Structures are given as C-alpha cells and as structure tokens.
DNA sequence: TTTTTT
C-alpha cells in the first residue's frame, strides 16, 4: 500500500543502524560500526544494502529524494537506545573482531553482534599470525635479553608478561605498574613494540596527570584517554631534587576507578570508561606526597635490569653495579620496530600470555616491595 | 474541511503530547516521557499512535511529508504549559512506574498521570523483585558483613539504611552524608551497589563543588544534578597537606535548598532543581572554613569498621585499631556487581527501607556528635 | 481580492498583534499577552481565532501553509512600535488583570489597555480569594509566630509588611533590604510562601550581582531580573574570614536605578528594566566595600528573632541571645507551602497591605540604625 | 515584458530605497528613514506604496510571493551608494525633520532631502512645542533649583547648558564631561529629563568604555552608541582606593575621536561614527591612568551643590560644606517625569540654548581646573 | 538545446567575471572591478549586462529566478584562476585608473586592462587637478605650518613626504612609521588629509594587532587591511604603567610580509594581500617586548615639533623644550576639511612627491637613530 | 578558557 516504507522496514530488520546513548545513530558499513554525526551515512547504507532486496524494490534506491524518504521513515522508527563496547575479551581490528579466549577472528556478520565502536586502526593477517617465521625468533631475541629467563628474574619477568598481556582486556584494572630502570635499558624498545602492536587503541600522555588536580575546569587529556586501552606516562623528572613537584597519591586513587570525573574543553559531558592499563615510565625511584595504605594497594614495580652500549663506554659501564647484563646496541633495531616489524608477532605473543594469565579472570595485583 | 487536521485533534484529545515551563515537547512513547532538546520527537509519536487511529487515518502516516503537517498543527494547538516530576514517592522505569507507598507497578495510562520525565533507564522485572532468590542470600550476607547487627552497630546500621533508602524519593532532602572509614572497608562496594540499583538517577559529581564558588562563569558540575535522586563525591583528598582547600561552608547550605543556582556552557538557564541526596565518600574526617550552629544541622555520618584483608596481611590488620572485623577479601565480588546480578534485590531492600523509614514523611536528621570540631563547639 | 490577505487585515484590526520596542511580537492568547523570542507564535493565534471570522474565512486557516500565508501579511502590516509595562499598580494572571487600587479582577478586553507581558503563570479563582477560611487563620498563626505583634516589635513588623506588599508593585525602588537572623528563624519560609504566593514574577539570582562587575561578558544572572518584580539573593556568606570578597557599593548604586547595564550570551541588547525589590537573606551582618552617605540612603535591615527547635535543643536555644522567642518546629510545614495551601491567603494578606502602605504614593525607606 | 519588474522600476524611480556605504538597505516609510538588519523592510515598502500605483498593479502586491520577486529585483536594481547623516544641525523625529537654527518643522519630501537615519522614536507635537504654559514654569522652577541663578554660580550654570545644549548636534565633540557632586544633589534627574527629551538619541552604557581594552572580540557596549547624540555613564567606583581600575587615559583619546572601532556579535563591521556628548556622573574626582596636557585638553567637569533632603535630615545637612543650598524632596517629581510631562517644554529650553551658544560653531572647551 | 547556458557562455566572453585565487568572484559594472562576499554581484552583472545581448535572450533575464541559473552556470564554467592588481603604479578610482609614472587617466575599456580590484570610492574630476588653485595656496600653507622647510628640517620633511606618498603605489613596503609628537603638533590633521585624499584606499584598526596574537578565530580587525594601502593605528597606550602590553615584535614580524593570515566572521579566506603603509601616531616612545637588530631594520620615525595654541596658553607653550615654533590655532579647519574641501589639490601634491623618490624603485628606508 | 560563530 505505501513502500518506500516495507523498504525502511526491511532495511530495520537486519540491525545495520543503531540509536546510542548519546543520540546519535550508528551504521555498519564496509564490516565496522561508524558514527553518524560527522558524515551523513545512512543513506549510502541503502545504496550498499540495495542489492539484498527484491528486484521491484531495489530500483526505486537509484534515486535521490527517494533515498532521503527512506532514511525520514527509518529515523521515525528508532525509539530506545542501546549500548556499546560491552565485552572486554574482544580486540576489535579495522576489518573483524578477534576472539582472545579461542583465537578465532570473525569478519562480517559474525563481528557484528559485539557493537565494538573502537579499533587498532589496522586490518588484520592471518598468514602473519602464525608462530614460526624469520620475525618471530627475532623477536623472541629482542625480548630475551630485556628479561632474562634467568630464576633470579623469574617474578619479574611474570610481572612484565601479566602487563603486556592485560593491555589487550578492555575492562577497568586497579594499579599502576611502575617500569623502572636506568637508562638504555629497553623501555621505550617495549613501548614501542607494544604501540607497533595494539595501534589506536594506545595513549602516550604526560606528566600532568599524576601531579596536577584532575577537575579544575577542563582537562583535555580526560576525554582522549576514554575507551583506550593503554597508556604510557614517560617523560618523568627527577623527584629527589629540591622544590619538584610529587605524585599527587589522590591521582593515583583516581586513575583506577570504572569512572574518572573530568571534562574537555568546551564541553558538558563529565564521565568517561576506564579502560585502561597505566604504566608510568620512570628513571629514578618514585616518591609520593604521601604514603597511606590505600597508596600500596594500587602499586607494582617492574625492574629493568639490562643495559645496551656502543664499544665506546662499554667498559665504563661493565663495572657499574646498577646492571645485571650489558649488551651491545643495534641501530636499526628502531627502523625495523617502526616499519611494522614484529607487529603481528608482538599480537600473538600477547594472546599467547593472555590466554595463560587472565583466562579464568582478569586481575592485577600489587607488589609494595 | 482537513483530514490530517483530524488526525491531528485526534491525537491532541489523547494527552501524549504535552509542553513544558522549561521550553520542550515532551511525548509518551513505550510507556515513559521522553524528550530530545535537539531535535523533536514528535513524529516519533506519530508514527507509533498510528494503530490507535481508525483505517483511513492511519494509514495516511505512512508518509514522512504528511507526518510533518500533523506535526505542525499539533505545535499550533498547544498553547499553556504544565508542571512536571510533582509526586516524591514514586520511581519510574522504562516501563511503568512503582508505587513507593505500597509497592505496585503501574503502567499504561495508569502510570502517566504521574508525569515524571527522568528515568532509571531500564526495564522493570516482575519474577526478580521478590524476596526468596539466591540472590538476596548472597547480598544479605554482603550487607550483614559491612555493617553488621551488633548492638553496639545499632544506630549506624539504622542511619546507614535511611540514608539509602533516601535515594528512591524525589524530594530535597536538607542534610549531606558523609561515608568515613579506612581502607577496604565497603564504601565503593556500597556506591556501586546503589549505582546499578537505581540505574540513571544516580550522578558521581566532581570534588570541585564543596571548595570552589558556584557563580563564576559555567559550571556544568552543578548544572548536571538537575532532578537527579542521589550524587556521590568521591575521593576528598586531606585537607593538611599541601595544595589543600577546605570545605566551604556555604557552598554546603547552598545544596540544601530546592533551587541550586548555577549554568551549563553556552546557555543562560541559571537554575536548577535539587532532589539528590548527596554523600562524601571520605577517608579523612573533613575539615571546614567555620563552624557554627546553621553548619551543624547539615550534616551526617555514617562508619565503615571491617576490613577485607586477603589472608597474607591479615595479622598486620588485626594489629590496627581502625578494624572491628579482618573478613576475608572475595575477589570475584566486584565481577558479580557490574553485571548487575543484586539489581532487583537491593531494589527489593530499599523499598522495604522506605516502607519502614519514611512512609509518614520523609526527612533527614543530623548527627553532630560524630566530628570532632563539632564536638568541640557542641 | 485574496481572502488570505482580508484574513490578514481583519485580525489586525482587532488588535490581537503588536510590535514592542525590543523587537518582539507580543499576541493576545487566552486573556494573557505572550510571546516568543526564538519562535515567534503569531500562526498560533491565527489558529485560535478563527473562531470569530466568518464562515467562509475560518475553513481556510485548517491548513498549514495558509497560515504562513496570513503571518507574512501580518509581519508586512506592522510598522510602528507600541511600549509596554507603563502600569505599576496592576497584577497580570494567566486569565486576567487584578487592580491593586480597589481590588477589581479583570477579563477580557477590559484586561487589555493595560500592555502587561510579565504574569503569575497561574490562573486566579475567586472563590479561594476570601478573608476567612481555615488556611487563612493557618496562614496567620504562622505569620504571627515568625513576626510577633509584640509592642518592641512593632517597627520591624511593619518593614516586614511594607517590604512583601512592595513585592508586588511594578515600579523601580531604591532599597535593599537585607533579612538578617540567626538560624532556623523563618527566613525561607517566608521566601517559599512569597514564592508561592507570586508565582514566575519571582526569580532567585547568584550572589555575584553583589561582589563581581556587571560589564565583563555575557552575565545572565543579571540579565534574568528584566521585568521581574522580586528578586532574591539567599545565604550571604561571611565576609570576617579570609578569602572572602566584600559587597561593592558601585553595584548596590547600580541596581536602585531604573535601567541595568548587562547582556545576556550570543546577545547584542544591553538594557534591563528594573521593576525588582532585591532581598538578601544573610546569617551575619554585611560588610561593605566602602560607606559613605549614598550607601546608606539605600540600605534597610528586617530582623528575625524566633527560634523553632526540636524538642530535644529546646533548652540551649532560651539561653542564646539571638532569640527572642523559641516554639516546636512543624515536620509537616514546608511541604503544605510546596503544595500551595496558602497561595491565595497570602495573596490576599499582600493585597490588603498594599492598600494600607503604598497606596497614595509607593516608595521605600532606609533604616541606617541596624547596620553596624 | 514582466508586470513585476515595472513595478521594481517605477518603486526604484520613486528613490523611497537606498543603499549606504555601511551596507545597509534604509527605506523612507512614514516620513522617516528606517533600516533593520535583522530584520529586512523592503516588503514593508513595497507592500505600503501600492497605493500610489494603478489600479491594475496594486492589487498583484496583496501576495506575499509576489512582494519577494519585486524585492529581489530592487535588490538588483541597486548598485551605487550614497552617505547619509551628513547635516549636524537637524534634529529628526518620527514623523519629520526640526531644522535647529530657524525653528521651522519639515514632513514629505522638505525632510526627505536630509537622509538622518536616526530618530528620537515619537511624533513631534507643535501645540505642546510653545513657550508659555504650566509645564514650563515649573521646570523652570526645578532647573533653578538645580542650578541656581546667582552670580558665583554663572559660569558653571553656562557649562551646564552648553553640555546640555550640544546634545541635540549631531557631530563629533572633542571633550568629555563629568557631573560631580555629592549625594541627592539632581545628576539622575537631569539624565532622565534629556532622556525623556531626546528619546531614541540616547544611549547608557557601562564603565568597560573607561577601564577596559575596547578592540577584543564583540564589544555591544560600544558599537551601541553608533550616530547616537548622547552617551551617559553613571556610579563609577571610588579610585583613591584599593581593587579599583583606573581609567584608562588612552580610552579617554579613542573616545573623542571621529570614528570608534568596535563590533558587535555576528558582524563585521569594525568602525562606528562618533557623533555623541558623553556624560560621566560621579559621586568622587576621576582618578586617571596617567597625566598629561593630551588628556586635560579634553575634559570638561559641571558641579551640583543643592542638596534635597527629607525634612528629618535637614537640619545635619546645613552643617556640610559640600552644599551651598538645602532645598525639600518632592516625592512625586519622579514619577512625573517618568510619564513624559516635560518632554517638549525642556525640548524648547533645550533648542533656546541652542540658538544662543552653538550657532556660529559648535565646540566644547575644557576646564582643567 | 539549452539557452540558459548559451546565455551564460555569452557572458563569459566579454571577460566581465573573473575568478581570483582565494575565491573570490570580481565583475566589472559601471567601469570598476568589485568584489563583495555580501552583496550579490554576479546577479547584478547579469541584469546590468542584458542590454549587449540579442533581444530573444534580453527579455529571459527581467526574471529573479532565471538570473539565479545563470549565475549557477556561471560558478561551474569558472576553472581557472586569474592574478590580479599586479601593476603597482596605478590608482584606481571610481570611474577609471590615474598612471602616476605618466599622468594620463584611462576610462571605460582603456582602464580594463589593470585588473584593479580596490578603488577610491569617489570619480575623478580634472578640472580641480590643477597646479595652481587658491586651495592650493592654503594647502601648502598650512603643510608648511605643520612640518617648516627649515636647514634642520629638511631631514625629516623627505621622511614626511616619502611616507606619504608611499600609500599611492600598491604594492608590499617593508616598515612601519610613527608620528611622533606631542600634543596639538599636527598627526591627526594629517590623518584626516591622506584620508580625505585617497578615500577607500584608506583603513583605520585597532591596537590589537600590535599586542595581541592575530592567529585566533574570525580577525575582521586584520581581514580589513586587505589590498587597502594605507592603515592607521592611532593613540597607543603610555607601556610604563602598573601592568601593560608591549608591541610583541614579531607581529612586527608578521606585518612586513605580504601574505599576513586573518580571516572575517562566515567566510574561509585566510591569506590577505599585504599592500599597507603602516602608521601609528603615538605620543609617547613606543616599548617593545625584546629588541633585536632585526626590529630596527623596519622602522621609521618621524617628527612633530610646531604647536597649534590658542591665545590664551600661548606664553606657557613657548617655554616648552618639545616645540619650535606656537602657531596661532584656527578652529574651522578641520569643518573644511572634513568637507573633502583640500582632497584633489593634497592629491596633487600626493602625486607629484611620489614622482620624485619612488620613481627608480619603491623602497621604504629605516630610522634607527 | 568561554563565547562567538556556525
Ligand atoms: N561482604 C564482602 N565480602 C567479601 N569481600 C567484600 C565484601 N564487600 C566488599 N568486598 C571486597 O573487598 C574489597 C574492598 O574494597 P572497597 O570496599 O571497594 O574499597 P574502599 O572501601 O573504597 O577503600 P578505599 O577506596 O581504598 S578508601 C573489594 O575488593 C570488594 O569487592
Ligand atoms: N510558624 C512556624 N511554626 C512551626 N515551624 C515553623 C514555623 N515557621 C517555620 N517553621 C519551620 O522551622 C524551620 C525553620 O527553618 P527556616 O524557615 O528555613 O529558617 P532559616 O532562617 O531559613 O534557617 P537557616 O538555617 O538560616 S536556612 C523550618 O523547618 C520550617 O519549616
Ligand atoms: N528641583 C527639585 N525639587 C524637588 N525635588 C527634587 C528636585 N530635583 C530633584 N529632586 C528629588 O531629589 C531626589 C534626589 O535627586 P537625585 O536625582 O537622585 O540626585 P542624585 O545626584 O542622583 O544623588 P545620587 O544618585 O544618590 S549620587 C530625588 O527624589 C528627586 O526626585
Ligand atoms: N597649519 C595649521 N593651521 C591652523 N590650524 C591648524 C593647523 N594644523 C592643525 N591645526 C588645528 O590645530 C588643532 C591641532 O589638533 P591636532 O593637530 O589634530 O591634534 P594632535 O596633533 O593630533 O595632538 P593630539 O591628538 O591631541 S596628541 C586642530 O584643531 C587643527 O585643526
Ligand atoms: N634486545 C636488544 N638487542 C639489541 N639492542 C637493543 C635491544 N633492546 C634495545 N636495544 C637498543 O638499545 C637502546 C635502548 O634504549 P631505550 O630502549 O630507549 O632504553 P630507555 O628507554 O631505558 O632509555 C635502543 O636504542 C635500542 O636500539
Ligand atoms: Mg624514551
Ligand atoms: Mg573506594
Ligand atoms: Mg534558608
Ligand atoms: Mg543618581
Ligand atoms: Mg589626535
């Protein structure tokens, strides 16, 4: 009697626009949910799911003013909202979803039915995720001399797998790892390995987040840090000089609730989603405002204990008794890292620890040693 | 002379479109009053009231530019506004509302009298809100080991309850609440107990609004507890080290009143409706600007003694004199919270709290003999 | 011909449509002028008159687009501005005008000369609006517990009632009473049953009128008192402390003219019409920026001296000295006040000291005694 | 070979449409030039002279659709542009011109020739506009009060009515004025009387013209006072003490000078055509930024010395040396003046004074003093 | 098959629009080229242009709605850019364009050739270009009263003149002049006489784009001075003060380069053509934020030292160490010359000083001393 | 920063 309307019908029923909390629509398109408020992309659904309906019906979508009728009569029919990113043991990449209890990784309508609004940004090789390559005993390598397999640095080395491994979770973690170490000790080598691995869903921000007040008018790095998945706080002064400013001990109780209180610029919405897996990247022992207990309930500690020098200060540094192990340098292992190297060898290793440490439950615990 | 004049009178005579003292349409779709500043939702309304109208009417609303010609001679007709969320003791869901003075669901016509336009945000569940599940064991159980029946416990627990039960009734309650004891003790436990029972009507507010004036400029902290039924504060840093404000005392008389004054970014409403409950969840007793008698009838207090040590610093808490009982620590109890697995029976204990508190009238009492500079001036 | 446009010119003469020196176009709907600056409701009231044309010409205002039609010949006729709000001694409802003179209520177009746009927001019955009933006797029980009709408090009763009665003149006045007492004396009781009593010509500003410039940016909360008859400024804070800012006299100078300097956000319009009489409820004694005797020409204090106590503090409250009286506090009071039981008393009460106060002239008076 | 563009044509022959340098559309209906940006009048025009056309083109101007045709082809029809506001010495009302130097009152197209975009907003009356009559006489009286005759009070009394006199000129002044006295002394009730006389000419703005940066983002206070005759200011602070502004000496010199820049919201126009006396009441001295002869060539001051005191306080206030007359307060005085009773006799005083200091030229001097 | 667009392709031959780099759309109606982002100038030109086409098509364009589809083929037909006001010897007026370097004025299709897009404002009038004119007479008078031709000022008279008639040639210049004087010198009777002499040509800003950051949001305060050749940014503040601004020497900087970066409110043109001759008359020694050898390299200083009194302050003025000479004051000059009454014999003399310095090459020399 | 823009 009225089509145009079963069109609209039709289209309702196979779930490809969503209403959201925030009020505003979401479409699945080209296998991943995108947002309606920047482009208009309701419309050029229909022209993609045109294919999937009745002769008769398909022809009238090759034509505007038509097409804007469809989409009138589809918004006039989404009337209670749903929410999102609701299961934390999925890592949504740019082309599926991939499953960290099983391994599997589903495309199409299969990652359809976890409305994951984030991504790494990346699409995602299954002929690159496999275990033996001449790439994943480079990297096996590369990690072995940071953390030796040694049984003097056997905890250690448990504490660091746990950490990288529940960077993949996205739920919310009570603590904040510390990742100590002199310098040239391969820190930054991790960070980078792990940014090269994870892609968008990682957060490198400053110092101002654990010395600063959190809701004193806006906070622009509150409202970045939502729905991420890590974040590295490298670039941390020396606190055993005069006058520098402490770790505000309020901030480190702040940053491990479900719900951190602050608001962008320009902006009345104050919540977001905590996420995250904080790791502060320090060079000298950290000191706090003040010590209580419910500071070392929320604090463990990772040494690094493993230095790499050029053949110039070699010698210097073989008799300092900050290291365990001294190693020589290599140039282009930081070209290789930035080029995508060990990126999908990094991913398996990960799901590898993650389904080894966190697959009963997902927890992390303190270490106020 | 017009049928989609008709049609729209028709609409008009059943009472689903109404206009409100703030400037908005609000409508009644899926048994709840909804409303979208940005944009109207009136022909949402249009397009679902459609069945109820007879054949030939109806099926005119199939068509998105006739939708809007309705719409428009719905807008020409309303003319006077109407007062909206007048009765206290009423908790409305996403379907229906519940009576608080007897516990009955209502729905259909029978719950939009009541014209409440806030929400938990959820459905109501019939074969859950009951009192003999498993559920309600365990969280008895949770319940009794954070405050528990002793009789040296008997007045806390009491307050305890109150003040829980506080936060189903729509009303300004004049007294603040403040949630003092050590660590690991339930105060987060307590909060998102409350938080996944009552759903959407509950707000976590940033510390800001007790140190800082509530005038300059926007504060969106303010302007975001507008008909909400419960704020939680949380993490009030020491007020002795360095940095440290202190609680003004004015800005606590200030939200007691019904009308809290105070504007959101880019706009120019600048009042506010106050039916929150509002608690401090502390760790150090708060210390204030200046103490006088207006400031000791504001205020409330509530202990946490029972910690919840795992069994390798058990001793070390049996050695604080901060502890009554070293309970052990359940680790997968936080898991059972956020899946909303105790919803309907904390529902189900608040309103038998309700039932026994505050029936007669609702209303909140002090407590000044529990802060020591108030117990200096007392 | 163009009936559309006869439609036009028929509703203009019956002067239902008028232009104001802002900019508005006020109409006259449901016994009330109103209007709407972002959306301008004139097809409102083609709508609602068609009632009163002719057969032929209300068959044709059913359709959405004629309404436009007819609006664009009613914007097009309009050229010259009227002024409104000249009449201080009227009361504007929701269904009429009540004339404070003699206490008349009136309807229709006799409720029309008289270019009201502010109003109650509430419709006015005649049957509540009686001298005796119980509420009445309730409402006086009350009035005479918070300002008893002692003989010491005599002078102060009677700035108490000179004060409320000019709550409802609509003139500028040149004074800012401050409600000063100590705790639990009955101050917001008193500005909850004004509140109720007035209705939306009551709003409720932040205490930066007082101690802030009104001239740096956007201020609504000085922008919001336009036309508003009552103006309240709850809960003062202390000024011995340190870190607190002191009441600038330039602003209490500012605010007793007839015209206010302050602009609302994304608004190019400043001017304000000051109709308001502004009270402070404080709990301590004010302290100034700076006191000379324009200060003081414009300053008056209402005392409050009566303690209502729970039965348990009774007795540390007789040996203050801040009080004067003590009585048992009523659980069951504020929420009859919310529910509007003595709206209409309390009006009555206001009216009759109107016309016993303000009637020949209405002016208020400082009492430069009370301030320390 | 269109009926709609001939009836553009003869409206625009008509020359009752201009176009200004500003960019404005001003149109002459009902004896006045009128514009409004935020609201367009072409229409207006167009749908008001269809009475002198013929017959068979007045009645195709009752469609609102066929109004906005005419106007777009007026609106094309434009391309040159004219000044306007260019005689000083003519005062424009709503219903027609008063020429300041003879007396004479122009309507139609005498006051057609004079393109004065302003207007006080109200009909100008001739059987009010007299010289003898009741409301004469007793502002005489109030003006003689104010500022009494005698012979230590002629020089100040002359100021008072030159400042008054010019306000009625309509070109640049190069001095600012400030009324001092102390209290209850009569500032407010000259402000409301040449306010009731001048209408729509004046303007009161705040004191962010005196102590404030006026180029920064959308200043209405000052794009306000745009070909206004009359600026007034009111309560300043007392300066001599502390967490008070001073005022701004450079303000004082972009104040006097034929062009202000400033703009208000949604608008790009940055310059506005000084044409204003501006007035400065006080209760103290002004206390200015910096001295120097730039500024005290442009400052002129008027002293009020009667003081109008309830007859309870009379009797302290002959005891005050900053008064030289203790008159008694009307009560009723206010409200009379509020009401326009007034208007056209101080109108008349006001032109008297004109034709006696501001014919030859019209300048204002100051007094460094 | 479509005479819409045979009529629009006709217009496109008589080279009557052009499409500028940053967008803008110029014609050419009444013998000048004009841009205007406001105004609707294409549909002007059509409608002014119907007459130079076949009788078939003239009639078509009398309607508004047609015009409207003409213009939109228009804006589709225009691909390729064209550079603009190249030729910086000419001066473009309104009825034609004044060769300085010759002496000739081109009109009509002879002054098409120079694609000038600014103009002065008024038309062009030979008879009043003459050499000899009592005008001239009081012209050269009063310029000699304000700077004399003394031995000592004759360095300072070349500066005066260069700068001055440096805002003839349209093109980059690379200082920024200041009338340095004290009060009552002259600096503002010679604002106003290059003002009444070169007309639009001439810009009036505010002080913010000397101490304030011109990179943030909609600047209609920078956007104005585009293509102008003149603008003035009178009476700077005393920097020697309880908290002030200083000249922020690298908007210095930026206001020597000839693609200085603003932008108006509702429109995306960022880049304007620096072709201004900056001038600020101060009072005091500006005071920048940091000095370099640099900032010297581009500014220019000139002085003021004859003083305008009135008799009775002449005696204190001839004791001041600032002056040289106290001239007798006249008080219907400035009515004179805001009557455009000295605008062609100043043009003139504009003329013939730059037809003696910038003749070889335009450069703008700095005053260091 | 916000507000203005937009
Ligand atoms: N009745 C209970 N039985 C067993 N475990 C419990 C019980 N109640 C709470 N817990 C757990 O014990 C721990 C107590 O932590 P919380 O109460 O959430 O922290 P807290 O009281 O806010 O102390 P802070 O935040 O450090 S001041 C949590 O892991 C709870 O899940
Ligand atoms: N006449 C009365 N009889 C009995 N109770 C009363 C009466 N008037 C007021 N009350 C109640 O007594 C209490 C007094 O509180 P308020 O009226 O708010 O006094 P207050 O001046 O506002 O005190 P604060 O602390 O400064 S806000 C309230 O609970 C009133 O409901
Ligand atoms: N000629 C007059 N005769 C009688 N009363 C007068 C006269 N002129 C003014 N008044 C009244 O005297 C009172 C004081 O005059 P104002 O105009 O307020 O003086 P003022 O300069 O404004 O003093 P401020 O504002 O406190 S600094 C007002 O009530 C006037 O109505
Ligand atoms: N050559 C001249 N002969 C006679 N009068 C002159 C001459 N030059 C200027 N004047 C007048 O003398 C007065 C001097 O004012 P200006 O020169 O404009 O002020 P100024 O030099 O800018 O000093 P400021 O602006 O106060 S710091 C004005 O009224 C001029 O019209
Ligand atoms: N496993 C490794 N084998 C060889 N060279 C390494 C290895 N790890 C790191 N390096 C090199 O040693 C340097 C370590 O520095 P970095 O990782 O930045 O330590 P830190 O972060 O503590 O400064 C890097 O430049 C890297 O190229
Ligand atoms: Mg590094
Ligand atoms: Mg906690
Ligand atoms: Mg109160
Ligand atoms: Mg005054
Ligand atoms: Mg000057």
Same mark, same amino acid.
């Given at each position: 009697? *009225?089509?145009?309307?079963?069109?609209?019908?039709?289209?309702?029923?196979?779930?490809?626009?969503?209403?959201?909390?925030?009020?505003?629509?979401?479409?699945?398109?080209?296998?991943?949910?995108?947002? *309606?408020?920047?482009?208009?992309?309701?419309?050029?659904?229909?022209?993609?799911?045109?294919?999937?309906?009745?002769?008769?019906?398909?022809?009238?979508?090759?034509?505007?003013?038509?097409?804007?009728?469809?989409?009138? *009569?589809?918004?006039?029919?989404?009337?209670?909202?749903?929410?999102?990113? %609701?299961?934390?043991?999925?890592?949504?990449?740019?082309?599926?979803?991939?499953?960290?209890?099983?391994?599997?990784?589903?495309?199409?309508?299969?990652?359809?039915?976890?409305?994951?609004?984030?991504?790494?940004?990346?699409?995602?090789?299954?002929?690159?995720?496999?275990?033996?390559?001449?790439?994943?005993?480079?990297?096996?390598?590369?990690?072995?001399?940071?953390?030796?397999?040694?049984?003097?640095?056997?905890?250690?080395?448990?504490?660091?797998?746990? %950490?990288?491994?529940?960077?993949?979770?996205?739920? %919310?973690?009570?603590?904040?790892?510390?990742?100590?170490?002199?310098?040239?000790?391969?820190?930054?080598?991790?960070?980078?390995?792990?940014?090269?691995?994870?892609?968008?869903?990682?957060?490198?921000?400053?110092?101002?987040?654990?010395?600063?007040?959190?809701?004193?008018?806006?906070?622009?790095?509150?409202?970045?840090?939502?729905?991420?998945?890590?974040?590295?706080?490298?670039?941390?002064?020396?606190?055993?000089?005069?006058?520098?400013?402490?770790?505000?001990?309020?901030?480190?109780?702040?940053?491990?609730?479900?719900?951190?209180?602050?608001?962008?610029?320009?902006?009345?919405?104050?919540?977001?989603?905590?996420?995250?897996?904080?790791?502060?990247?320090?060079?000298?022992?950290?000191?706090?405002?003040?010590?209580?207990?419910?500071?070392?309930?929320?604090?463990?500690?990772?040494?690094?204990?493993?230095?790499?020098?050029?053949?110039?200060?070699?010698?210097?540094?073989?008799?300092?008794?900050?290291?365990?192990?001294?190693?020589?340098?290599?140039?282009?292992?930081?070209?290789?890292?930035?080029? *995508?190297?060990?990126?999908?060898?990094?991913?398996?290793?990960?799901?590898?620890?993650?389904?080894?440490?966190?697959?009963?439950?997902?927890?992390?615990?303190?270490?106020?040693?």
């Amino acid at each position: 009697g *009225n089509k145009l309307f079963n069109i609209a019908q039709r289209i309702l029923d196979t779930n490809s626009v969503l209403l959201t909390e925030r009020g505003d629509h979401i479409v699945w398109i080209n296998n991943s949910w995108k947002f *309606n408020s920047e482009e208009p992309l309701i419309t050029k659904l229909i022209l993609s799911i045109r294919h999937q309906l009745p002769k008769e019906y398909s022809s009238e979508l090759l034509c505007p003013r038509k097409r804007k009728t469809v989409e009138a *009569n589809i918004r006039d029919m989404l009337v209670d909202s749903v929410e999102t990113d %609701t299961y934390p043991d999925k890592l949504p990449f740019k082309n599926g979803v991939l499953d960290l209890v099983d391994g599997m990784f589903y495309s199409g309508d299969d990652a359809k039915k976890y409305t994951c609004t984030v991504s790494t940004g990346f699409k995602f090789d299954d002929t690159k995720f496999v275990e033996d390559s001449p790439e994943m005993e480079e990297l096996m390598n590369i990690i072995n001399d940071i953390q030796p397999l040694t049984d003097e640095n056997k905890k250690n080395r448990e504490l660091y797998e746990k %950490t990288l491994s529940s960077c993949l979770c996205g739920a %919310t973690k009570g603590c904040l790892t510390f990742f100590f170490g002199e310098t040239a000790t391969g820190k930054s080598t991790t960070k980078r390995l792990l940014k090269s691995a994870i892609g968008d869903l990682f957060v490198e921000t400053g110092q101002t987040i654990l010395t600063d007040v959190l809701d004193k008018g806006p906070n622009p790095f509150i409202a970045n840090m939502h729905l991420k998945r890590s974040v590295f706080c490298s670039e941390l002064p020396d606190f055993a000089c005069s006058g520098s400013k402490k770790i505000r001990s309020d901030n480190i109780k702040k940053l491990t609730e479900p719900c951190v209180i602050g608001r962008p610029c320009f902006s009345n919405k104050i919540n977001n989603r905590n996420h995250a897996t904080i790791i502060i990247d320090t060079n000298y022992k950290p000191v706090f405002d003040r010590i209580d207990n419910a500071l070392m309930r929320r604090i463990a500690v990772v040494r690094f204990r493993t230095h790499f020098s050029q053949p110039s200060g070699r010698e210097a540094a073989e008799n300092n008794d900050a290291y365990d192990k001294v190693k020589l340098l290599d140039e282009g292992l930081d070209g290789k890292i930035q080029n *995508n190297r060990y990126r999908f060898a990094f991913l398996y290793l990960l799901v590898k620890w993650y389904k080894k440490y966190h697959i009963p439950i997902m927890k992390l615990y303190p270490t106020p040693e």
